[PDB]
Design a protein around this nucleic acid. Structure first.
Ligand SMILES: [Mg+2]
Ligand SMILES: [Mg+2]
Ligand SMILES: [Mg+2]
Ligand SMILES: [Mg+2]
Ligand SMILES: [Mg+2]
Ligand SMILES: [Mg+2]
Ligand SMILES: [Mg+2]
Ligand SMILES: [Mg+2]
Ligand SMILES: [Mg+2]
Ligand SMILES: [Mg+2]
Ligand SMILES: [Mg+2]
Ligand SMILES: [Mg+2]
Ligand SMILES: [Mg+2]
Ligand SMILES: [Mg+2]
Ligand SMILES: [Mg+2]
Ligand SMILES: [Mg+2]
Ligand SMILES: [Zn+2]
Lengths: 127, 60, 116, 83, 99, 155
RNA sequence: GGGGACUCGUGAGAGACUGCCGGGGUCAACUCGGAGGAAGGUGGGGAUGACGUCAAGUCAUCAUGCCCCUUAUGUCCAGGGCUUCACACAUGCUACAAUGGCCGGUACAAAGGGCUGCGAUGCCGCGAGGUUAAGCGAAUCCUUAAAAGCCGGUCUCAGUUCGGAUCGGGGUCUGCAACUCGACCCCGUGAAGUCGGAGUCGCUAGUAAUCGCAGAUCAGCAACGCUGCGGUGAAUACGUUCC
């Protein structure tokens, strides 16, 4: 069976299809630099791949949906780390120490009634 | 509200834009919804009493 | 380079340089410079005198500029006063004429604060 | 009614108070309660009594107020000054 | 084929699945075939009123209204189950459609 | 707060320059969540910094900070009927924080056109010891060297 | 066509309890730190307001004891008023620009609304809109193009290509009707404002800050309000001396 994993960050959902290859990020029918133009997002897409040193192999492609450019970048970080385990069960103590298996549950706090935002209160004005 | 003005809003007024909605239970002119036909006060008693279905308190 | 009596300031791009004429904004300056073939990205110090003849006859045939626009404005304000309409009663006292709020505002039609 | 698809708006109870006077050429004052009516080029020379809230105000359509409403010439609010 | 499409809508859970899994189970005994109850997404109306009848803008109640929606879509058409879809004891809170 | 220290937040290494000091500089430039805008200023000003020296700019950046780190600050306290300043020692991770606030803070009111060239002048005028952020080092020290008499009130 | 792999929708479940290990403590409650784990000590957030205080608020949601009006304080309608304006305060918005304005190209959302409706597509109009009409009682069709962002070009510190108040002209839509007193569009005009005195407010993490989108009321709308939704995303907290 092919490798079918999923990671999700805030509202993004990635579907990584890790295949053994030469290293090529054709995300959603689009290359890496064309989809994530920022250099900082490109560091954490391949950050699970530099801890294990398989950056020259294991070419991926995924489906991207929901969220923004950084939620999709953070969700794809979780998808790589949850795909290397299914092809290699011995680098599990290496990825868990760097904090790459953690889903990082951090959502947008809801607006509360009587306040302008989640926590931002109006002016006080005691007189 | 006044009993003369509750019957006026129920009938057929001249110049059809002149019509408006009151609360079906008390006759309040303001803050009357269209899904229920009730004002915000009368919505609050009947949703707690269970007298109109689907509606309960919400938390997310 | 005096065009209509307006004296276009030097070293200014011609799309913006024509906006200093009283009656020509930015959108009119896109069609002054379209029927006369002059490009937008042109410094006004490189303005050929043969080019300047082509926009001293397009303006006097199709637009309304200094003098005979500033007198049309002060006559329409004049017309509302002698008929005695609402805006003529409202132009005489310096209060806003378009139904603006006059309780905590309208500092433009009035002066600064007075603080009685 | 303010669009150039349905013409101007004059009340039906005011056209047949002036078209019964345009034909027999009299200048009687019209006691109206219709501020919203539009001065059209048939009101030229007539005089109206427009209701402002408490009384009737004599307005005289000369020639040049032929594009306005009839209620712009009867000031509703009274104000002199705070002192 | 796709001839009988039913569109059960209700206000509460444990009344829309009990009315489909065991009550519109009464047709597969005739030798028909269903594709199971298909859960659709749920509508959530939102209301937010002032608690006080006067002057207290900052105190509020939130009332919702969930409408659960399911779909069954039995495949095989038989003339003796046309009436067997009519005489079914539905509860009061559930509305049925025939598409 | 009342209940001891709060856990401070980690900073990942910057991908272009292998150092945590650059990614700590982009968070002082950052306003209104425009982080990709704040990274095009700090990456831009460091590349403008190597075109006037030739030296690698994160080596230029650390010599810009070693001339604006304060060693003594001047925290205040009220004692009796007159309040007066007290010199205390600055811990090392505050000296990095209080210096990067001064490079970004005095470059926003410097006389050039773009933020990329205002920041690149203040780094180079602090690597030589001539800028206006350097002058606040020997104004913080002069106010801390005129108050050694009050060093016995350390809260 | 078809597929049950992945996601999502939504039903029933598992999961976190100091359960396990080490140190401190009457072997106590507990406490500091490790292993596993998606999550660790209440995982984040909501719903939830004890006995009572303020003769706190509402006789104008409703209900009501007394007192009062009954050819008027009842009641119908047309106009006007709640929108005034020497001023004073409070809450917001847009700003004073280069971490920006404008022009062109190009990515990425969530939660909602729709039959007295949603108006695709095609055409006409500079545009708000007009007209024809396919589809859809909606995970199906429409609302729907998210905007900040990214790339490139221009402006060069000026009361300006910043600001968009005010005023002149011409329009559209809703409605019996837009004068008093509606939003929106176009052309022109281009005021104050160059970061704010004493004082003072909010916020400890997906927070503040900033950028848009949807709803309820609603023919239309003075929606910059309210209640929600997601995108990008900080800096600090030594400490209890002082308020
Ligand atoms: Mg937010
Ligand atoms: Mg208050
Ligand atoms: Mg109405
Ligand atoms: Mg409890
Ligand atoms: Mg009292
Ligand atoms: Mg009272
Ligand atoms: Mg009473
Ligand atoms: Mg009336
Ligand atoms: Mg009012
Ligand atoms: Mg502008
Ligand atoms: Mg653009
Ligand atoms: Mg067109
Ligand atoms: Mg000035
Ligand atoms: Mg300036
Ligand atoms: Mg707190
Ligand atoms: Mg509306
Ligand atoms: Zn009611």
């Amino acid at each position: 069976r092919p490798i079918q994993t999923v990671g999700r960050r805030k509202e993004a959902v990635v579907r990584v299809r890790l295949v053994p290859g030469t290293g090529k990020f054709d995300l959603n029918g689009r290359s890496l630099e064309d989809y994530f133009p920022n250099k900082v997002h490109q560091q954490l897409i391949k950050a699970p791949l530099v801890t294990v040193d398989r950056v020259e192999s294991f070419d991926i492609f995924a489906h991207l949906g929901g969220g923004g450019p950084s939620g999709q970048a953070g969700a794809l970080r979780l998808g790589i780390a949850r795909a290397l385990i299914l092809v290699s069960p011995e680098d599990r103590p290496a990825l868990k120490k760097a904090g790459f298996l953690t889903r990082d549950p951090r959502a947008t706090e809801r607006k509360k009634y009587g306040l302008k935002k989640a926590r931002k209160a109006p002016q006080y004005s005691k007189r | 509200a006044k009993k003369a003005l509750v019957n006026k809003a129920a009938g057929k007024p001249r110049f059809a834009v002149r019509a408006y909605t009151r609360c079906s239970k008390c006759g309040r002119p303001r803050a009357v919804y269209r899904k229920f036909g009730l004002c915000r006060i009368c919505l609050r008693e009947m949703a707690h009493a269970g007298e109109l279905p689907g509606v309960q308190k919400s938390s997310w | 380079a005096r065009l209509v009596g307006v004296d276009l300031p030097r070293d200014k791009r011609m799309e913006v340089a024509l906006t200093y004429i009283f009656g020509i904004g930015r959108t009119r300056s896109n069609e002054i410079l379209a029927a006369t073939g002059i490009d937008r990205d042109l410094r006004t110090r490189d303005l050929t005198e043969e080019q300047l003849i082509h926009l001293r006859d397009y303006i006097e045939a199709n637009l309304k500029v200094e003098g005979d626009l500033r007198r049309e404005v002060q006559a329409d304000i004049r017309r509302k006063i002698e008929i005695g309409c609402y805006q003529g009663l409202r132009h005489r006292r310096g209060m806003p004429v378009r139904g603006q709020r006059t309780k905590t505002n309208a500092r433009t039609r009035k002066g600064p604060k007075r603080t009685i | 009614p303010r669009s150039l698809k349905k013409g101007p708006f004059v009340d039906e109870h005011l056209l047949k108070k002036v078209d019964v006077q345009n034909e027999k050429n009299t200048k009687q004052v019209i006691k109206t309660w219709s501020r919203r009516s539009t001065i059209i080029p048939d009101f030229i020379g007539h005089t109206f009594a427009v209701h402002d809230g408490r009384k009737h105000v004599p307005v005289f359509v000369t020639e040049s107020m032929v594009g306005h409403k009839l209620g712009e010439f009867a000031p509703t609010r009274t104000f002199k000054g705070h002192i | 084929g796709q001839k009988i499409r039913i569109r059960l809508k209700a206000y509460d859970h444990e009344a829309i699945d009990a009315s489909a899994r065991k009550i519109v189970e009464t047709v597969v005994r005739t030798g028909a075939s269903v594709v199971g109850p298909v859960p659709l997404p749920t509508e959530k109306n939102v209301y937010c009123v002032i608690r006080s009848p006067h002057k207290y803008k900052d105190s509020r109640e939130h009332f919702e209204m969930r409408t659960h929606k399911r779909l069954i879509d039995i495949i095989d058409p038989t003339p003796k189950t046309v009436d067997a879809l009519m005489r079914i004891d539905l509860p009061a809170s559930v509305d049925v459609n025939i598409q | 707060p009342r209940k001891g220290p709060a856990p401070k937040r980690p900073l990942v290494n910057d991908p272009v320059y292998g150092s945590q000091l650059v990614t700590q500089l982009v968070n002082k430039v950052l306003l209104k969540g425009k982080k990709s805008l704040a990274e095009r200023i700090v990456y831009g000003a460091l590349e403008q910094a190597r075109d006037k020296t030739g030296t690698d700019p994160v080596i230029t950046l650390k010599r810009a900070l070693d001339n604006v780190k304060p060693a003594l600050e001047v925290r205040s306290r009220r004692v009796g009927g007159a309040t007066y300043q007290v010199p205390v020692e600055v811990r090392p991770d505050r000296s990095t924080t209080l210096a990067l606030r001064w490079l970004v803070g005095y470059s926003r009111q410097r006389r050039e056109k773009t933020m990329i060239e205002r920041l690149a002048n203040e780094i180079l005028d602090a690597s030589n010891g001539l800028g206006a952020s350097v002058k606040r080092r020997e104004d913080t020290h002069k106010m801390a060297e005129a108050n050694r008499a009050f060093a016995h009130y350390r809260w």
